[PDB]
Symmetry: D3
Subunit: 239 residues, 6 copies
Amino acid sequence: SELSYRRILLKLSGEALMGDGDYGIDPKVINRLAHEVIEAQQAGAQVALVIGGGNIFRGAGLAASGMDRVTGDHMGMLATVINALAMQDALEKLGAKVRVMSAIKINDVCEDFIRRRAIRHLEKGRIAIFAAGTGNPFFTTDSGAALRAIEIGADLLLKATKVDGVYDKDPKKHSDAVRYDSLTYDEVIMQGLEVMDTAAFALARDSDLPLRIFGMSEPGVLLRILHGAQIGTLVQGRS
Amino acid sequence: SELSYRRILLKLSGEALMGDGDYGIDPKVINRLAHEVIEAQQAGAQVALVIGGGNIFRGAGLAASGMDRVTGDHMGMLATVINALAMQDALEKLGAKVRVMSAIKINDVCEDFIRRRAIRHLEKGRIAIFAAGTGNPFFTTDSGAALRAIEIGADLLLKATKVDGVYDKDPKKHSDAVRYDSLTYDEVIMQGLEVMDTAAFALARDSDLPLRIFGMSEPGVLLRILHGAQIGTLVQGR
Amino acid sequence: SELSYRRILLKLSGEALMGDGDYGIDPKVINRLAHEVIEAQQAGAQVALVIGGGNIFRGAGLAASGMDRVTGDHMGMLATVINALAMQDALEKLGAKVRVMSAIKINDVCEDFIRRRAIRHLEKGRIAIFAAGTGNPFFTTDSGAALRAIEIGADLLLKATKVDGVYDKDPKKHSDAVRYDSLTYDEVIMQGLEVMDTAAFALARDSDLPLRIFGMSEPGVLLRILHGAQIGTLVQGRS
Amino acid sequence: SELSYRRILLKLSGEALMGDGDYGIDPKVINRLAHEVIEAQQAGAQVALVIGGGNIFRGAGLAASGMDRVTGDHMGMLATVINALAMQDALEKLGAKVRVMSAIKINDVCEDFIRRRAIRHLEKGRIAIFAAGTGNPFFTTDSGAALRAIEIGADLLLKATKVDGVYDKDPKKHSDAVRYDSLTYDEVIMQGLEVMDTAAFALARDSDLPLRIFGMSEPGVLLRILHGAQIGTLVQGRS
Amino acid sequence: NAMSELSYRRILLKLSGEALMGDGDYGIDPKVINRLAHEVIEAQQAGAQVALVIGGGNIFRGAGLAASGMDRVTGDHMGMLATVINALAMQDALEKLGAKVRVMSAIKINDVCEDFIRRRAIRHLEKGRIAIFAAGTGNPFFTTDSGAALRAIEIGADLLLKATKVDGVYDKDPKKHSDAVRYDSLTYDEVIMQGLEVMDTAAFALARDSDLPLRIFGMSEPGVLLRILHGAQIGTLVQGR
Amino acid sequence: SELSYRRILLKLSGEALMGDGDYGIDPKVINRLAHEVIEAQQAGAQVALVIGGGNIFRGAGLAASGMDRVTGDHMGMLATVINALAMQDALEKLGAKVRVMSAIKINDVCEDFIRRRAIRHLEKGRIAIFAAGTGNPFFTTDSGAALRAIEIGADLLLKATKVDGVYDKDPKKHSDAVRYDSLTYDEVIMQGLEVMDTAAFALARDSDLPLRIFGMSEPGVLLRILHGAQIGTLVQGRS
Ligand SMILES: Nc1nc2c(ncn2[C@@H]2O[C@H](COP(=O)(O)OP(=O)(O)OP(=O)(O)O)[C@@H](O)[C@H]2O)c(=O)[nH]1
Ligand SMILES: Nc1nc2c(ncn2[C@@H]2O[C@H](COP(=O)(O)OP(=O)(O)OP(=O)(O)O)[C@@H](O)[C@H]2O)c(=O)[nH]1
Ligand SMILES: Nc1nc2c(ncn2[C@@H]2O[C@H](COP(=O)(O)OP(=O)(O)OP(=O)(O)O)[C@@H](O)[C@H]2O)c(=O)[nH]1
Ligand SMILES: Nc1nc2c(ncn2[C@@H]2O[C@H](COP(=O)(O)OP(=O)(O)OP(=O)(O)O)[C@@H](O)[C@H]2O)c(=O)[nH]1
Ligand SMILES: Nc1nc2c(ncn2[C@@H]2O[C@H](COP(=O)(O)OP(=O)(O)OP(=O)(O)O)[C@@H](O)[C@H]2O)c(=O)[nH]1
Ligand SMILES: Nc1nc2c(ncn2[C@@H]2O[C@H](COP(=O)(O)OP(=O)(O)OP(=O)(O)O)[C@@H](O)[C@H]2O)c(=O)[nH]1
């Protein structure tokens, strides 16, 4: 119809999946998220999802020290597959065709990431769900999210965080805090504002990937954003 | 030298790994479980390990009731790799050599189960840690476990569960069942006792695989069983 | 459709491919079976085949009494890949679209087995042919057939054998052997009647897989069955 | 030290395994052959084997007259994996160390072929058994043996046949059939003699591979040839 | 462009890697790469199903890479990888002109392109895609020509076109005989008999085994490929016995 | 014995292999390099090397500015396998044991990168050659070298460049220039000195990987460095 962003990639921490739970997934949250996503898709947007695995890579048993750093990242990556698999069902049950694609080979469980396939999947009206990040350890979920966004040539990367947008002085350690309507990559760096870890930000800044930091709490957000509403902060261009 | 069982495979429900917490794993039961395992290799035994994923694959959101079974089984498989890796890491810190092997290919994370390879690894005195069951959906963790046991030509499949063995009707409820110090295969079927699901039990039976249902509550239980200790039940023969 | 069952899985022993020879494939038998299959498909049936390998993996040299059981199972598995390849070329000679899918990776030769892919193929009018059982040793052709049936959500698993159905008394012992029309998994277990090995039978038992044991003596029979013919013995139900 | 040839590749047809039978493998024949291979390997030879598949890929059912040639060849390649597996067993029963290596990937069943791995296996004293030819249709087993020979740096390529060497006229037509002791590659082609198919013969020639065509007529033949004995025909050099 | 004008339906066109070089001494001349792409697209528009095979000699060259005493196999792998690079270049030039391309490799490099599967390759031809085949047969010791003939037979091609410097097969060396003539056609046998070079022995036999029609010609001027496809007697045709 | 660094990763440009050429590999530059590496080896160091592909993926034809960036990065990754394959040949000629590992699967040609395998190889005294960077487009060779260095627990990442260290200005037109002997990561950032691209540096910063930026002008610099010598610039520390 009238979209301001044709192809998008929505990334979330996955702790966000837990909800008020302390672990795993909360059927309530995943149900709303799947619904948000399905509205986006129906509206005409080719949608891609990235979801971290922090809801599963939890506890002293797992996330506590000693654990070989590489081994923990591998585990984390498996966790994001499990999550991707749950979004796949929740969504298909609701009529969408889903294509989970993993940055590491686990062919039994889901297909391999291949840029040319992914694009064709988005073009056919399917939801792309990416898992396992970039495929290497030492890279955050934002990095893989950025990379994937750039590969598929997305119009916008949506990073859903607890705080809705970027603020000057914490929406807590201040009452007067104002939400930047928009920012350039440089304005961010110059003002020491932090959005994604250095590497992930550089990656996004080299391709000038439109970023949007925002909440996700209120239903209909994707629909507003797709239709133009200035929601959260928008990171774009290079001053 | 001088053991009742030379190549062994130890099977845990994984939900075991949780112990205190309701999810994931607690380092306590892991470290100790690793020790029990180290100790067997010390004795001079060839050890295999298979652990479930129900500790990571749990909760309403993940193990949803109206959930596709395959999707769900894949998730469980994945869960078992996670636990497999945790054990690898814990076991390696204590200096032991290990080899995690997956029934479904995930080479980034660990090698593929290759029968000739898993065996070879045991001969070099490494601990084989198998994950992802048989790599098929609809098969229990028991099935995968029996399969691998037969595969490596294991002398003994050890299943650690809640109850300390195989009881007629269970402990407490009905003049405290007498723990059969043994029980042929056909006997288990005739009497309709539970050990493993039909399919798993059938596999184990067909190759005449010595079972052994027991509890790992006291530390040192494994070292004893190997020597000759008659703990828990022991399923065998016809 | 114009037939009761639409998505079915037909399983033969493959020894049932040698006809009157003592090892190969019999052009008679395979052309005859091709027509049956082509016919059903032409009537809207989504057909999957599983054919064993006892016609290739035979002889003292190959099925040596001793011999590593695992390496024997691997020969049987490859045997089924060869049969499937033959069933492919025969079906394609008659204008059918075929997808052979093996449970062990041999991608040069035929496509890997992937549940989602297989269904797709089926709902596209193609004949799916599965080879190499469950991909595991110590598992019979039937287990592999039950597994695939459940996986693809077939309405019926047809197992073609010598004895047409199941009888109370042994049909070669008594002339007064009675053939049941139907039976429940319990009724079979309890009467200690044998239709598949324990494992295979159990697998299908956990999914109430509608089994049909029958003899593929004369042509037409496959089509009659899809219409509702009380041929052989139906096994279905937890009763 | 006493050897005229340290690394050799011995190629046999698949029919060489059947014995008097009309299919599969004769336990007694594969045993002799195994014994002869051990005798060589113990005298300090490094041995690669290549066995064809015509003992399994035979009969009007499998080797159908007008079947798809690619499908035909793939069936054959699978036939060879089955033979190599049987050879492996036989050899291993008698304490030999063995590595089956396939030209197409079937990792479940046997390891992949990789030139560096293979040469290494040979250095360690293992018997190398190569299956599936070149991994391509339209190429013969002879071509696959020639290829493997060059890749592993064989000192000699042996091709075991029914007729002990190359005779001017078939040793059944004119009773005065004379055997050649040595022939250049060019002499063979010149005399229109039929040793290997054109492509395989050219690979042998261009790679400078001495080639001995002989029959395994009696025990100890392989070992003798290994010590320089002139049995059968030697194809070497150019004109 | 009337499909009724097609003398050949499915073709495989084969070039040496050096062709992409043009005047430079290395790699790819974008001038050359574009004209090739234009010729190919032109053939596709006439209704042809087009398969492509380009060697790696433009990249695997120089004392350093192709050193006289290096390991023959690693050398061949190098060429194979060169071939994958060329194919990607072609993929990008063709796609930029609106063509739909599928690179397929004889050795698995799945990040980079799909691997060769016969039945897949054929379906791509059916759907109107240009197939670009890389890495020969996937084995060392086989020439590009060998991979080319294999692929041609495997996809059921009506013709294998090998582009070379010389514009056909002459009865005699034209650089040595002024009376030398270009054959319009030759049987596979007449080539052997007259000791004429067309492909190395192994690749010729494989082509000969399946009676693959071959057309040896020179891509000297634009439009030559479309003319061949419309029946032009250009270069030399090898076919039959 | 001595040795101030046990496990190193030496990273080269690629064009560094060209020498007096405009493309490819100068066999002179490659041999004295092998020599340097082999010397570092024969002194007890465990050596991993990473070489770019700029010598091969260049010229408007290959490195076309208007070309799809992903497929260009892929061409680059392939060029680095070629380079790796040539180093391997030269080093083995001089008697070294070499393991070439690529970040994207190409098993025919070399092995996959697997962190535990690479460590093992390094413990058995083999030279590890890493090709294809991280396996993702949009990532530099630096990024790849930093990753591998961390993954393998390198004690030092050497980066050979055009000039002999980090300077406060261009030393080729300025005899004025001041070379820094050592810098902290945070110093490099605030002084705006270019060492690596931002992502690579952050990747290197997070694990506090010791960097040694130096020029391989004269034979023996590698060895000297291994022995404590203070050549080029050292980057390290978090002040
Ligand atoms: N687990 C797993 N699933 C796969 C793989 N490849 C494809 N699939 C799934 O199989 C289903 C259908 O397979 P595809 O082969 O992608 O079929 P397609 O022709 O693109 O799609 P349709 O047009 O919908 O038939 C999809 O839902 C994919 O998610 C794989 O390698 N592994
Ligand atoms: N993630 C992963 N690790 C692997 C894989 N294959 C081997 N490894 C690990 O790499 C390490 C050593 O590799 P190996 O291939 O065993 O090397 P090796 O030649 O046995 O010689 P040893 O290390 O002495 O056995 C071990 O920790 C293995 O578990 C794989 O496919 N994936
Ligand atoms: N041998 C082999 N064939 C394959 C493999 N994957 C796909 N195919 C074959 O490729 C051909 C078609 O390619 P697909 O990948 O199915 O293409 P698709 O768009 O679903 O389907 P079509 O509509 O049939 O073109 C069929 O003949 C398949 O059997 C494989 O791994 N091995
Ligand atoms: N089926 C199959 N077997 C394999 C594969 N890789 C190795 N093997 C077998 O595994 C056994 C030994 O494992 P390897 O990894 O070769 O061990 P290795 O350390 O070189 O050599 P050894 O330990 O002396 O065997 C041998 O019998 C191999 O044939 C494979 O990919 N598939
Ligand atoms: N690099 C790489 N690309 C692949 C691979 N497999 C498929 N592709 C590409 O993915 C894209 C689409 O996949 P296909 O699955 O072939 O789609 P299809 O539906 O026939 O055709 P379209 O929808 O018309 O593109 C194509 O550009 C293929 O080149 C692979 O293994 N590696
Ligand atoms: N091309 C390619 N080569 C491989 C691959 N895996 C191993 N190799 C090579 O094969 C050779 C020997 O196999 P390895 O399995 O490394 O043997 P090893 O037991 O580690 O011990 P060595 O024989 O001492 O090297 C080595 O040169 C490895 O480079 C692979 O996947 N592809």
